[PDB]
Amino acid sequence: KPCCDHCSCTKSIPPQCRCTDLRLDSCHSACKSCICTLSIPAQCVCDDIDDFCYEPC
Template identity: 55%
Template sequence: GDDVKSACCDTCLCTRSQPPTCRCVDVGERCHSACNHCVCNYSNPPQCQCFDTHKFCYKACHSSEKEEVIKN
């Protein structure tokens, strides 16, 4: 849907496995629009992070996309 099209991530971590397992580790006041498992702390403003995993990364929200590979 439109939520997936508008979802974005600046810092995406992926494993080296094939297919990779990727997770957006951006922290912000809310999670991206396609996030199903969003966890926020109770600070003001809230610090939220999405814990969904995918076989891909969403497009960058800003121009400097960071994609890192983490070891399994």
């Protein structure tokens, strides 16, 4: 489920945006590159770059 509570974007055109959220167990559904701690519950980061931010969670 694609949402982001904290998005960071560059100030250029096209903008470069990422979600810095750390989430439990898994990244949102639209995340293509999800990296996670090797523990349970997993703490996971999406590091996809996009020209937009997902809507707030």
